[PDB]
Amino acid sequence: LEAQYRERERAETEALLARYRERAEAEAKAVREKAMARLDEAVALVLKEVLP
Amino acid sequence: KLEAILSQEVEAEIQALLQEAEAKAEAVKREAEEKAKALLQARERALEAQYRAALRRAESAG
Secondary structure, eight states, rough: OOOOHHHHHTTTTTTHHHHHHHHHHHHHHHHHHHHHHSSSHHHHHHOOOOTT | OSSSGGGTTTTTTTHHHHHHHTTTTTTTHHHHHHHHHHHHHHHHHHHHHHHHHHHHHHHHHH
């Protein structure tokens, strides 16, 4: 009973991780693409305060 | 005459006894089935907890 309970959690706790890995890199990707299209705006904002 | 039959009046008292102890050899087995069983109800719940716990940890990690 132990044996098939330990093998129950293992065969889910690799699948769950594998799937979380797919989501981690898409949710990294989901902030990069927003940022590079709201880019000329950061650069402008910074610049106006480094020249006094 | 009772001679051989004389012995069947004992074999009937000493058959009453032997059935009273096969009414204890049943009771003993009842309690022992209800024991063996309960040791696996505890086995079931504790493992269930350790599987609830193992997936919850692995979600927070994920």
